[PDB]
From a paper:
Staphylococcus aureus FakB1 is a prototypical bacterial FA transfer protein that binds palmitate within a narrow, buried tunnel. Here, we use a combination of X-ray crystallography, NMR spectroscopy, MD simulations, site-directed mutagenesis, and functional biochemical assays to characterize the membrane-bound conformation of FakB. The bacterial class of FA transfer proteins is called FakB, and the bound acyl chains are completely enclosed within the protein interior.
We identified two alanine residues (121 and 158) in the tunnel and mutated them to bulkier residues to partially occlude the FA-binding pocket and push the FA out of its pocket to destabilize the fully closed FakB1 conformation. The 2.35 Å crystal structure of the FakB1(A121I, A158L) double mutant was also determined, and superposition of the FakB1(A121I) and FakB1(A121I, A158L) structures shows that they are basically identical with an RMSD = 0.241 Å. Thus, three independent mutants generated the identical conformational change.
Author numbering: 1 to 288
């Protein structure tokens, strides 16, 4: 038995872990109305993408990995000699990448494809990849791995702050007067992941109080977990994410694993400039 673990680009794992464990990546894409297409990888400049998103009158569209990259990746893993492939995808409720990976897993002969719906995104999704790899190293069975990941999904979440009301207007989700009143009142919508769906939670004035609410809610949730791993997922606003990270380091005991990360173009295209998330998992994920 030879078990491998792969994922998509929305897991936003650092290139270090991808090189160390040789994790395969099915990249997503983001295309603008001008024809400019960005394929998610650790080589493109996120600053250029943010500058484009600012210099674009219309919001871009996002694209799941085409029903092809999964096929070649499974084929290469089978040619290398792998009996089982555990695939970790972003939330199937927000994207079709999980469905495309599952469908591609049916057209590849010679290896079992275990597609997993992480119901999350970013490093919170990459935590499933890290746990799967760790438990392959421990000598677990793919069914036991899927069971463990499903149990982990029960104690895993992500809260989010949207800062770009102009981006929400550019997508048509809000009106002009709404955006103006939100800017005047410093209104910052707070959202959360629930069963793979992004649902509203609070509407907090100013980004500072919204960050405090993020911390309060996540700490209240993880107080009951035997193991806690927190993740700051920042955007182009370095100061906000760094402040939240340092506040967590000061407020949380060392028994908590606090980490920092940043999301890429596919997430930024829908979150806008200044978005910031706090995610949690109820396990001690091996981040090295
Ligand atoms: C850590 C930040 C989380 C914010 C995530 C916001 C993105 C919502 C949906 C993701 C992109 C849409 C679907 C991906 C590509 C596609 O299938 O079209």
């Amino acid at each position: 038995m030879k078990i491998a673990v792969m994922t998509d680009s929305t897991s936003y794992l650092s290139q270090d872990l991808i090189d160390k464990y040789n994790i395969q990546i099915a990249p997503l894409s983001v295309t603008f109305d001008d024809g400019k297409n960005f394929t998610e990888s650790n080589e493109i400049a996120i600053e250029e993408f943010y500058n484009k998103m600012a210099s674009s009158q219309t919001i871009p569209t996002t694209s799941q990995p085409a029903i092809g990259e999964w096929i070649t990746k499974y084929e290469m893993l089978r040619d290398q000699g792998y009996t089982d492939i555990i695939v970790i995808c972003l939330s199937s409720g927000i994207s079709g990448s999980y469905q495309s990976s599952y469908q591609a897993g049916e057209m590849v002969e010679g290896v079992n494809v275990h597609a997993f719906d992480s119901k999350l995104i970013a490093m919170i999704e990459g935590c499933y990849v890290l746990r799967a790899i760790e438990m392959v190293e421990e000598g677990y069975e793919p069914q036991q791995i899927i069971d463990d990941l499903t149990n982990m999904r029960e104690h895993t979440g992500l809260y989010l702050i949207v800062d770009d009301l102009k981006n929400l207007q550019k997508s048509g989700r809000i009106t002009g007067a709404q955006a103006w009143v939100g800017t005047l009142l410093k209104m910052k919508p707070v959202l959360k992941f629930e069963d793979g769906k992004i649902i509203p939670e609070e509407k907090v004035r100013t980004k500072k109080r919204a960050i405090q609410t993020l911390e309060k809610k996540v700490l209240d949730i993880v107080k009951d977990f035997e193991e806690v791993t927190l993740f700051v997922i920042n955007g182009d606003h370095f100061e906000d994410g760094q402040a939240l990270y340092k506040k967590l380091q000061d407020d949380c005991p060392s028994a908590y694993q606090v980490a920092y990360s940043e999301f890429g173009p596919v997430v930024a295209a829908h979150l806008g400039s200044g978005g910031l998330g706090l995610g949690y998992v109820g396990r001690k994920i091996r981040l090295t």
